[PDB]
Design an enzyme around this catalytic site. Structure first.
Site, PDB file in Angstrom:
ATOM      1  CB  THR H   1      12.978 -22.279 -24.183  1.00 54.61           C
ATOM      2  OG1 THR H   1      13.681 -22.833 -23.064  1.00 54.61           O
ATOM      3  CG2 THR H   1      13.894 -21.331 -24.908  1.00 54.61           C
ATOM      4  CG  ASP H  17      10.188 -18.078 -22.101  1.00 55.65           C
ATOM      5  OD1 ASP H  17      11.321 -17.673 -22.419  1.00 55.65           O
ATOM      6  OD2 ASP H  17       9.910 -19.287 -22.109  1.00 55.65           O
ATOM      7  NE  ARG H  19       7.399 -22.216 -16.044  1.00 61.76           N
ATOM      8  CZ  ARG H  19       6.179 -22.732 -16.117  1.00 61.76           C
ATOM      9  NH1 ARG H  19       5.885 -23.604 -17.071  1.00 61.76           N
ATOM     10  NH2 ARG H  19       5.254 -22.380 -15.238  1.00 61.76           N
ATOM     11  CE  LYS H  33      14.342 -18.411 -21.276  1.00 58.00           C
ATOM     12  NZ  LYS H  33      13.186 -19.223 -21.708  1.00 58.00           N
ATOM     13  N   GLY H  47      17.923 -22.809 -25.932  1.00 55.28           N
ATOM     14  CA  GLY H  47      18.672 -24.042 -25.829  1.00 55.28           C
ATOM     15  C   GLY H  47      19.477 -24.130 -24.552  1.00 55.28           C
ATOM     16  CB  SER H 129       9.852 -25.916 -25.621  1.00 54.48           C
ATOM     17  OG  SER H 129       9.348 -24.935 -24.740  1.00 54.48           O
ATOM     18  CG  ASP H 166       5.766 -25.332 -24.178  1.00 54.36           C
ATOM     19  OD1 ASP H 166       6.733 -25.005 -24.894  1.00 54.36           O
ATOM     20  OD2 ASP H 166       5.776 -26.394 -23.520  1.00 54.36           O
ATOM     21  CB  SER H 169       7.263 -21.117 -22.216  1.00 51.79           C
ATOM     22  OG  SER H 169       8.424 -21.272 -23.004  1.00 51.79           O
TER      23      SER H 169
END
Lengths: 199, 204, 118, 216, 213, 202, 195, 220, 203, 195
Positions: H1, H17, H19, H33, H47, H129, H166, H169
């Site tokens: 995220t 992103d 994912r 998103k 979230g 994240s 990360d 993501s």
């Protein structure tokens, strides 16, 4: 995980499946769930695998030391008791074991149940494992002392088959060993899915 | 886990002018198998099925309330439901129990009754819609199913090879899951027919 | 503690204290046991008979239910060795669930006499 | 030790063409308090190894004591051997893991930099014994805030000149000062090259608060 | 009190062939939500006939190999020969068991040749049980590789298929395809692929990239 | 988190930092911590980030409608009592210590500390937030009765700069506000304009 | 849960034990012997947590046999019961033994002796005793019919009433029962009482 | 995220992103998103995905009420009030931390809404994240009053750094451009990650899987 | 609990309150919190009441015998390192943050903060105890590089009086000590002699 | 724990249930009837947590009678089992009914119907089913010998083998067993099988 073994007139029949699990994930389908102690003794696998394997390998070393020193093979009642005295000291530290010791001594057949809980009993029939309760029902309805050998093979494979059929946690390959007076011999190694076609 | 108390595993996969949906048949209580003919895929139309894995009592609860709402919908409107509307209805129905959630992650696979475009989707246990173009899987052996379907899926397949890949994906996935398996049904949804098949599977 | 070497090699291959230990054997009471094919009969000599003796405590002849033995020499050493052998025999009965063979406890006593020569 | 009390935040490091530069602030926090403001968290071990440590500061001073007495007892022999930075890194991996095995860790996360045989060394040790090398390292919140800038620059250009690496370190320390709550605008830079270890500091970063006029 | 393990990810993959053994691994090293390094190989050459695979907690992965190379050189002193593959496996089973009540959180996969020139893969648990296999996946992404290898190597759930032996050129493409499938769906596997092939001539390497995200 | 209000003759001077952290990561470094409840009444928000914005909308609503009906500029004590009722009524689900400051023509410059509890107390100066513990001793020593406006702006800037230096959960820019009859005069102290205290070097 | 019962008479002690070994829903042995011979005139009945029982019983047994080897005569049941109590009491240590014990013995000079012992090693001499949850159902019948001058046929009759109470009222399947009696002629094995 | 936003000279640039992970397994590869809320207001949701899904349905529905009722295009602060009142009323038990970005008659605005109902007004946001990695790029490179293309490259670079650094993501960069004079929803903008080519072929022919039963149900 | 030491040219000035509470009852209101480790070296005791005496007895034991062997007045850095070693060696069972201050002819006036941890750091001034949080901001603002003896005594008395006013766990009399080459001059500030700050009353 | 077993044949269902009611070590009732007649062609078998069983079974039973009162005909076993499932599932409320159920019924369009249901109200139609820990011991023998075309005397023999396995291996004293068969002529009571 389901293992069973039973004494009868012509020796001991030992049968075991081959499924090892990691939670819901199945890790292997080729686990050798009867551990070969020596040319005359067999041990079994239930609960923890490495906990079974280390103590039964060290017991094989112990009885080979005894064969070198006392110039004679080990009895079942001595060897299983040494396994009990090894596993008794570590109660409560998280060990998990279910075992059967199967051999041929001067008392004839031998079949003793030893676990990491400390229990040490004799008996004519046994079954240990997670799906062991299904194995008892199929085993005891055909069991008697006067069983013929091939009918004992059929009863062992059928009981492991129904135990693997009901237990989600049991499966793999039905391995069958036969301890006689002159040593133990391998009978067969059979997939469950072939025996579903046979049965 | 509460999802893994009964086991269960359902997947869908998109083909050229057809979709395939397959669910396991084991109805379980954590170690004890009870029956081997548990129905999880229910018809919600001519060319539209819904598959629900997870807690097997919530499969039947959600599916009875879903049929209750959907029959009122199709009697009040005078048409069959489009699959996107069924996705929004099931997400609404699960989200009405947001803090009291049902333990089912439904998958939907079917054909649009007018355009006959293939549609597949899945949801989480609380109602996030996930429309994908390749495959959606649901159940306790999700890693096995993504592992098979990520390598076996190829776009624009005929129904024969779509049957072949979803059958190999199911049979190779559930044989590494203890609490699922015990037989599998496969539904091939085509424009002109529905093909209902059961497979040879491991029964251990 | 006390850790000198007492038993050391002489100029020609003779552990002096082993020779003198066999001297301490050579002045003890003479003992015999003769094996028949269904009996083994033991015979030991008396020392200084002394008719005021209570004969019960001066017996020189059961390690287990099945095994006894004869000795010669210093009597307290003999009683020590018997009390070693009896506890080893009952530990054997603990671990193997069978009474002892005679070879096991004889090898144990034979090694016990050597370990205290080195 | 079960409780870290006086702690140090992020320590950076990046290899450049001819040596290694690491940096660290000069703050010892005590919870939220900026209790000690002029401590040094960079150790010069010998002429070709420098060392910076995040986390608990008392354990860093214990390692300064032990690893200083090791190189002094090496130099007493005077045979011409010196510990290469790979040897000090392996020693710290074994000491931190041996303290971990006793259920009594040294609550640190350390970066060893050095330059021996013309080759730059840059190695990471944490309190568990997870140890590796990298072209750039960052402990603590530097691993999320300053590590992406280091790897984003290193992807385009794997070989860095000295002033490029120094400005990249300064520009990452500006980011940590903007976005870490336990950092402090008073930092050191330690650079090992062919000539040996220097420490420059205290330095300061120059701020830009023009977004403060961008509320309404 | 000091939560003493961290799952540092990674998958390893070994396949025992007719006269070879292939060992593969990723090189991404993780800690929860972070990427520590993108070049950290998990294949460690032990002797000329055995390469080992590591997965799990990385500190025990380093400590255990620093033990094993020491034990190998003790053996080469005291016995005047290099260890066989079965000897290394039997040694490492005792080494893993002697830490019973504080286990090395390491899943070991020993690949290599036996003395008869056949491939042998020995896959272990943290507590020292071991078994010989033809192929094995371990570590994080094992549930995505192991059913596909169950399809392609054991030939299960296939009718009308000739069970051809394990050739090298098909097995290498199998290793590359299963790691592309693991990198597409598992977050922990990626950034490279390091492949060790053990044959009688020696050990060679091939490197292929994976997904960077 | 360090907020501060100082009463002087003819109005009040407010001050606040600008650092809002979640854990030890700065989530926002230009946070505006002075909320206008009316024209010349400001409340300051320390503690739970949700509650001090959620109650303040209800108090702004009630105080605006009350001021429309009564045809007057509303009192500061009224704005404090509307918090003293409400933050007491929900005190187990709020974590809110509010510092209300402002001006009214009837009683002048006023600073009310409403600590976590739903009481109310007028003070000559009020400090709040996590950082106020480090500057209690400064303001007990420096405060003189009846400072001018510029003296008070320097006093608020010094007392805030000390807490921003010592507390790790505080920092950023100093946002001041001087509320009086002439109106509200806000200013931002950034970079070099923040009063600097040399470290105890050597 | 395992069952024990013992009755001390004028010149005899009658003991009985259940012959079942269970494993959590199923019984795994239906010829289980909980009576271990200590010597010619003494038995120790042993139940409790598995593993602790057999190890403790055999450790006491080899010391009793070892005393007979060292001395040429047997322990009195008082001495062996206090010895077993001392070894079980040395509880607060790293080796606790959660074992429940009855000891029956016959002495030349004191006659028949029966000793009750819990896992605390509280030693109480009693005219009759019983362990298990089945003790709660049959110590009442033993309080009803026992007199100090019961001869052994009334003892087997009262034992049969007690085991029929186990069959009728007690919820665990306890179908077969082994019985032995000790007197001046040594140990005597009696016929198994079955249902 | 990993989602982001900037305030540039003519409006708002949002990024994301694609994912979406459940457990530690990638579940979706092309998840959107950037939610539609209004013709001018878009709401990136981080979230809990289902909670932000039903929230950006419900607030979108209430703005479809309100824009028709008043006959005007809605303000940012209207959706801000509705979001903060509902998310405070449920005390953060909706696990949705939002970025509410839009352009209304008073110019662009960018709000970051934490799940308990606390709101911040920001010139640039990052959530999820991988928020810290993109926040690094924003602290390094953001300037006030940037042009369109500089803001687009800045958000795309920040989403790229949050993708590469990360685990949580990856696999696409979506953008969005919001202004007074235009609305440019660029989906996707750049694809930094690409599936490798499958070297072997595993196409099972007809008859490979055994069949036990078969039923043909004809339709019209 | 509020202790404070301030370094000046030629020595250090120490200060401490005198209130020792168990719960919220004052167990002793004339507690002496300055312990002589040697002639001109004082340690201050904040935290666990047992440990800061029990370690200090061992350090006094080691330091006196060390001073007799070396035929030298012992250093303040030596007295700080003997705490830095020992409070680190038992830091899991000690709750001890010590402020060691003193004088030696070799390096002058010295103040070492040994926080809870077993490290060591020299500072120009050190404050400790539970009350020090309320007087961080005073001493960051008031301290000047190079105060005299009487300015340091007034600075220590003011900074202690502020913390005794605000912290409920501190109070009593102010016990000062000025350690220098000439010796140690101790003094007690009681009642009116404590520097008074008027309450912020309403006008 | 309580034991249930049911076997569904070609035109019949055979059900059996244990006849024991226990309390913590002892049984208080040895003629306990767990078979509750719903109507002329349906029985509802009810075991589980005490209190919930008889209340839930009688609350279903009065609605099954009430439908016949309102309508003049019987519920089908499919409709009655789905009704019982709906009332048991309606779980995520306060009120738990922790009941383990078997419903056996004969429909006059579909023939014999047997329904399994746990305390989650997961409804699964099966050719044979069993509850309790004895199900783990006896469903394997049921998989061993059951065929779809078992005639009813062979079904009594297969039941008797399962009950002898309860006697031989299972640790709870389960001595007496009641059995009923549902047919097209209604419900038939058979003789009690005892051991």
């Amino acid at each position: 995980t389901t293992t069973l073994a039973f004494k009868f007139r012509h020796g001991v029949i030992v049968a075991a499946d081959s499924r090892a699990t990691a939670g819901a994930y199945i890790a292997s389908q080729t686990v050798k769930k009867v551990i070969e102690i020596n040319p005359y003794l067999l041990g079994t696998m239930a609960g923890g695998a490495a906990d079974c394997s280390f103590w039964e390998r060290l017991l094989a070393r112990q009885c080979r030391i005894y064969e070198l020193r006392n110039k004679e093979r080990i009895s079942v009642a001595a060897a299983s008791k040494l396994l009990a005295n090894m596993v008794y000291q570590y109660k409560g530290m998280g060990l998990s074991m279910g075992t059967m010791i199967c051999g041929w001594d001067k008392r004839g057949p031998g079949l003793y149940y030893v676990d990491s809980e400390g229990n040490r009993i004799s008996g004519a029939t046994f079954s240990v494992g997670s799906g062991s309760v299904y194995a008892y029902g199929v085993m005891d309805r055909g069991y008697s002392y006067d069983l013929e050998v091939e009918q004992a093979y059929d009863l062992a494979r059928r009981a492991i088959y129904q135990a693997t059929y009901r237990d989600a946690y049991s499966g793999g390959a039905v391995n069958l060993y036969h301890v006689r007076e002159d040593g133990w011999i391998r009978v067969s190694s059979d997939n469950v899915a072939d025996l579903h076609e046979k049965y | 886990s509460i999802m893994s108390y009964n086991g269960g595993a359902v997947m869908a996969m998109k083909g050229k002018n057809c979709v395939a949906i397959a669910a396991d048949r084991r109805f379980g209580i954590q170690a004890q198998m009870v029956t081997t003919d548990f129905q999880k895929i229910f018809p919600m139309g001519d060319r539209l099925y819904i598959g629900l894995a997870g807690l097997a009592t919530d499969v039947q609860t959600v599916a009875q309330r879903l049929k209750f709402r959907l029959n009122l919908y199709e009697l009040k409107e005078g048409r069959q439901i489009k699959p996107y509307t069924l996705m929004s209805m099931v997400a609404n129905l699960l989200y009405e129990k947001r803090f009291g959630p049902y333990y089912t992650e439904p998958v939907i696979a079917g054909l649009d009754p007018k355009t006959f475009k293939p549609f597949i989707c899945s949801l989480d246990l609380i109602g996030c819609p996930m429309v994908t173009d390749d495959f959606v899987v649901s159940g306790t052996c999700a890693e096995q199913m993504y592992g098979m379907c990520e390598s076996l899926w190829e776009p624009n397949m005929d129904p024969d090879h779509l049957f072949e890949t979803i059958s190999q994906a199911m049979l190779n996935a559930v044989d590494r899951d203890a609490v699922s398996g015990m037989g599998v049904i496969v539904h091939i949804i085509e424009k002109d027919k529905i093909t209902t098949r059961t497979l040879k599977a491991r029964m251990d | 503690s006390y850790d000198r070497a007492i038993t050391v090699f002489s100029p020609d291959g003779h552990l002096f204290q082993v020779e003198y230990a066999q001297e301490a054997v050579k002045k003890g009471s003479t003992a015999v046991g003769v094996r028949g094919r269904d009996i083994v009969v033991l015979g030991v000599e008396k020392k200084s008979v002394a008719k005021l003796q209570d004969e019960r405590t001066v017996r020189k002849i059961a390690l287990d239910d099945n095994v006894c033995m004869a000795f010669a020499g210093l009597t307290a050493d003999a009683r020590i060795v018997i009390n070693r052998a009896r506890v080893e025999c009952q530990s054997h009965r603990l671990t193997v669930e069978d009474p002892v063979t005679v070879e096991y406890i004889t090898r144990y006593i034979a090694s016990l006499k050597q370990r205290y020569t080195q | 030790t079960q409780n870290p009390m006086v702690t140090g935040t992020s320590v950076l490091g990046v290899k450049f063409e001819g040596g290694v530069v690491i940096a660290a602030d000069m703050l010892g926090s005590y919870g939220s308090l900026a209790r000690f403001r002029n401590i040094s968290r960079i150790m010069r071990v010998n002429n070709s190894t420098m060392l910076g440590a995040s986390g608990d500061y008392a354990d860093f001073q214990y390692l300064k004591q032990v690893l200083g007495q090791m190189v002094i007892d090496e130099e007493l022999l005077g045979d011409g051997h010196s510990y290469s930075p790979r040897a000090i890194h392996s020693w710290l991996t074994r000491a931190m893991y041996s303290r971990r095995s006793k259920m009594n860790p040294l609550w640190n996360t350390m970066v060893i930099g050095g330059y021996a045989d013309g080759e730059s060394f840059l190695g990471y040790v944490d309190m568990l014994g997870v140890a590796y090398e990298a072209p750039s390292l960052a402990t603590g919140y530097g691993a999320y805030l300053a590590q992406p800038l280091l790897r984003e620059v290193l992807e385009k250009q794997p070989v860095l000149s000295q002033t490029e690496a120094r400005d990249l370190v300064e520009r990452c320390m500006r980011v940590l000062y903007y976005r870490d709550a336990r950092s402090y605008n008073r930092f050191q830079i330690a650079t090992v090259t062919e000539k040996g270890v220097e420490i420059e500091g205290p330095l300061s970063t120059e701020t830009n608060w023009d977004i403060a006029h961008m509320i309404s | 009190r000091f939560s003493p393990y961290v799952f540092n990810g990674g998958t390893i993959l070994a396949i025992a062939g007719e006269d070879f053994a292939i060992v593969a691994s990723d090189t991404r090293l993780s800690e929860g939500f972070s990427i520590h390094t993108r070049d950290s190989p998990k294949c460690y050459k032990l002797t000329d006939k055995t390469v080992i695979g590591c997965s799990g907690f990385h500190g025990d992965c380093l400590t255990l190999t620093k033990i094993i190379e020491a034990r190998l050189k003790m053996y080469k002193h005291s016995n005047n020969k290099a260890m066989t593959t079965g000897a290394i496996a039997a040694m490492l089973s005792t080494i893993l068991y002697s830490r019973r009540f504080f286990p090395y959180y390491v899943y070991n996969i020993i690949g290599g040749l036996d003395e008869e020139g056949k491939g042998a893969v020995y896959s272990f648990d943290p507590v020292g049980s071991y078994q010989r296999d033809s192929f094995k996946a371990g570590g994080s992404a094992s549930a995505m590789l192991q059913p596909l290898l169950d399809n392609q190597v054991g030939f299960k759930n296939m009718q009308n298929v000739e069970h051809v032996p394990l050739s090298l050129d098909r097995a290498m493409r199998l290793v590359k395809d299963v790691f592309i499938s693991a990198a597409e769906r598992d977050v922990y596997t990626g950034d490279a692929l390091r492949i060790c092939i053990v044959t009688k001539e020696g050990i060679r390497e091939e490197t292929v990239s994976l997904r960077k995200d | 988190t360090t907020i501060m209000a100082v009463q002087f003759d003819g109005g009040v001077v407010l001050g606040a930092d600008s650092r809002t952290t979640t854990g030890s990561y700065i989530a926002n470094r230009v946070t505006d911590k002075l909320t206008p409840i009316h024209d010349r009444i400001f409340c300051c928000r320390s503690g739970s980030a949700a509650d001090t914005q959620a109650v303040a909308d209800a108090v702004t609503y009630q105080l605006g409608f009350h001021s429309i009906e009564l045809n007057e500029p509303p009192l500061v004590h009224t704005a404090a009592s509307l918090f003293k009722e409400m933050c007491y009524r929900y005190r187990e689900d709020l974590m809110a210590g509010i510092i209300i400051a402002g001006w009214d023509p009837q009683e002048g410059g006023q600073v009310y500390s409403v600590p976590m509890g739903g009481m109310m107390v007028r003070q000559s100066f009020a400090i709040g937030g996590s950082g106020s513990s480090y500057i209690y001793g400064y303001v007990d020593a420096t405060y003189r009765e009846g400072m001018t406006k510029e003296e008070c702006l320097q006093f608020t800037a010094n007392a805030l700069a000390l807490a921003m230096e010592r507390d790790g959960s505080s920092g950023g820019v100093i946002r001041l506000a001087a509320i009086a009859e002439s109106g509200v005069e806000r200013q931002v102290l950034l970079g070099d304009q923040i009063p600097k205290f040399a470290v105890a070097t050597l | 849960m395992e069952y024990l019962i013992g009755i001390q008479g004028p010149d005899y002690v009658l003991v009985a034990s259940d012959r079942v070994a269970a494993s959590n829903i199923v019984q795994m042995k239906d010829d289980h012997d909980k009576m271990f011979k200590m010597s010619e005139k003494i038995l120790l009945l042993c139940v409790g947590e598995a593993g602790d029982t057999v190890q403790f019983a055999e450790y006491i047994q080899k010391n009793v046999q070892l005393y007979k080897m060292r001395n040429g005569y047997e322990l009195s049941p008082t001495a062996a019961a206090n010895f077993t109590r001392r070894n079980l009491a040395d509880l607060r240590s790293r080796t606790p033994y959660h074992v429940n014990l009855l000891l029956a013995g016959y002495d030349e000079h004191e006659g028949p002796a029966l000793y009750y012992m819990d896992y605390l090693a509280a030693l109480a001499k009693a005219p009759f005793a019983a362990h298990g949850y089945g003790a709660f159902l049959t110590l009442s019948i033993l309080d009803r019919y026992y007199t100090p001058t019961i001869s052994r046929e009334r003892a087997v009759e009262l034992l049969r009433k007690c085991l029929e109470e186990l069959q009728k009222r007690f919820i665990l399947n306890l179908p077969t029962f082994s019985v032995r009696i000790i007197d001046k002629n040594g140990i005597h094995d009696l016929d198994n009482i079955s249902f | 995220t990993t989602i982001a936003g900037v305030v540039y000279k003519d409006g708002i640039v949002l990024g994301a992103d694609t994912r979406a992970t459940e457990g530690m397994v990638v579940a979706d590869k092309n998840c959107s998103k950037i939610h539609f809320i209004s013709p001018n207001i878009y709401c990136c949701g981080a979230g809990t995905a289902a909670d932000t899904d039903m929230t950006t349905q419900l607030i979108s529905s209430n703005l479809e009420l309100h824009s028709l009722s008043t006959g005007r295009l809605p303000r940012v602060v209207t959706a801000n009030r509705m979001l903060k009142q509902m998310l405070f009323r449920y005390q953060g038990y909706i696990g949705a931390a939002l970025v509410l970005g839009g352009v209304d008659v008073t110019g662009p605005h960018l709000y970051s809404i934490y799940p308990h109902g606390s709101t911040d007004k920001l010139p640039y946001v990052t959530m999820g994240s991988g928020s810290l990695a993109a926040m690094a790029v924003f602290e390094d490179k953001f300037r006030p009053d940037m042009e369109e293309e500089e803001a687009k490259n800045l958000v795309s670079e920040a989403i790229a750094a949050g993708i590469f650094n990360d685990l949580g993501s990856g696999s696409n960069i979506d953008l969005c451009v919001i202004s007074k004079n235009k609305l440019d929803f660029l989906r996707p903008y750049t694809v930094p990650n690409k599936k490798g080519t499958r070297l072997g072929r595993y196409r099972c022919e007809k008859g490979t899987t055994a069949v036990l039963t078969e039923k043909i149900t004809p339709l019209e």
